Amino acid sequence: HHTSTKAERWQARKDLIAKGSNSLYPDAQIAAKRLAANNIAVEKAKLAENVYKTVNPLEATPGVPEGWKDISNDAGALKKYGLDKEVLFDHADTPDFLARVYQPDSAVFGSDMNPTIVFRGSRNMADWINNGAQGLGMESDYYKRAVRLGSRLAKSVSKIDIAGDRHGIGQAIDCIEQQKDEDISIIRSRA
Amino acid sequence: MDLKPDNYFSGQQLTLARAIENGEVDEVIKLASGTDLNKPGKEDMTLLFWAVMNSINNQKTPERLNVITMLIKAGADPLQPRPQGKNSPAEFVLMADNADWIKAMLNAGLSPNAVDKTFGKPIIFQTLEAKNTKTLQAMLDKGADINITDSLGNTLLIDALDFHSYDHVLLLLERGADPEIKADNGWTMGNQLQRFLDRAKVGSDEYKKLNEIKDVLIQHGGKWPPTPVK
């Protein structure tokens, strides 16, 4: 479906955006503004989708969007942001709170993107843990580890963005891509 | 609901699991010396997690708590991890709202400065997610280093404030935790406390609690206002 590399397509999309921003036509100018914002937003929504594919948080997550690297299991890379693997997910049961951290490839994105941490949405004999958690008075609060990460990221010297159900994310990506196609048409119409 | 040991164990592990289920301390002591204590059964169940599960609600009795102690004394590993980064029985019971279960493990001589086997983090950090400070109190009372750090130089005091675990913050300050420790990023707890204080809404419950923390920090000799981060 795609003939060129991700890097080539990223540059060609910015080239088209620049053509719209230089147009005398107001519709091409506003189309270029929205296209630039949606180009960025669709990359974040693709990462937000990717965290729903994580199974074992200590293993790779399949299908990381092109041009991004998952550093969630790289202690040295995480240290740069004051993070470690342990703080990225809950540990009493199947994770309810789960975050993944991704670094953009500068060969693809230049300086357009930042490292991004993405929070996943919150979600009989095998349910013995949940029984144990209830009798032990466990708080079981998604917000605790999320707030803790927010507090930590405010101290990061290196820039890092925050992003992030699975069906709703997919539909969101559809709506963004639809908007992109419409703005590309408007821009091409004014050449 | 009501668990059945046969869903997780067979053979000699099942015979021990039934003694645990029945809360029979002497039978547990007798059998534990000849049983593989650490090989998991089904659904990630281990004999030590089974003992925890048989000591809750109406089964939280002195004898059933002591079964946990006696299994650890016999060789059951309270720091054994579960798969996929899931935590050990010691870390799990540090999250509880009551310290009876961690005390049963400390009574078998588990070090209060122990670290977990997957991430290498001191298990005392898991107390910060508990709904009160009872498990942290039990760890400190047994002699844990109140100023212990994680791999990034964070103390319990620093991490508890970031967690918004404000009653843990207060307890740590009152027990003499050093508030001047800087993490690897050069921040103290107080540096974050100042950020939090400055953005809090006057008279909100968050404002009231953060100011209480500031007052207690000062009352215990901490430097205020904090030295800005370098």
Author numbering:
A (entry chain B): 168 to 290, 299 to 339, 446 to 472
B (entry chain A): 1 to 230
Task: Pull text from the paper.
The crystal structure also reveals an unusual interaction between the positively charged sidechains of lipase residues Arg180 from helix α1 and Lys461 in helix α13. Fo-Fc difference maps show continuous electron density between these sidechains, suggesting that the residues are covalently linked. The +36 Da mass shift observed in the modified lipase domain is consistent with a methylglyoxal-derived imidazolium crosslink (MODIC), and MODIC fits well into the electron density bridging Arg180 and Lys461. MODIC density is also apparent in the crystal structure of chymotrypsin digested lipase•∆ss-Tli complex. In the latter structure, chymotrypsin has removed the entire catalytic core of the lipase domain (His340 - Leu445), yet helix α13 remains tethered to α1 via MODIC. Thus, AGE crosslinking joins the N- and C-termini of the lipase domain into a topological circle. This intramolecular crosslink explains increased gel mobility because the lipase cannot be denatured into a fully extended polypeptide and therefore adopts a more compact hydrodynamic radius during electrophoresis.
Here, we show that AGE crosslinking is harnessed to activate an antibacterial phospholipase effector protein deployed by the type VI secretion system of Enterobacter cloacae. Endogenous methylglyoxal reacts with a specific arginine-lysine pair to tether the N- and C-terminal α-helices of the phospholipase domain. Substitutions at these positions abrogate both crosslinking and toxic phospholipase activity, but in vitro enzyme function can be restored with an engineered disulfide that covalently links the N- and C-termini. Thus, AGE crosslinking serves as a bona fide post-translation modification to stabilize phospholipase structure.
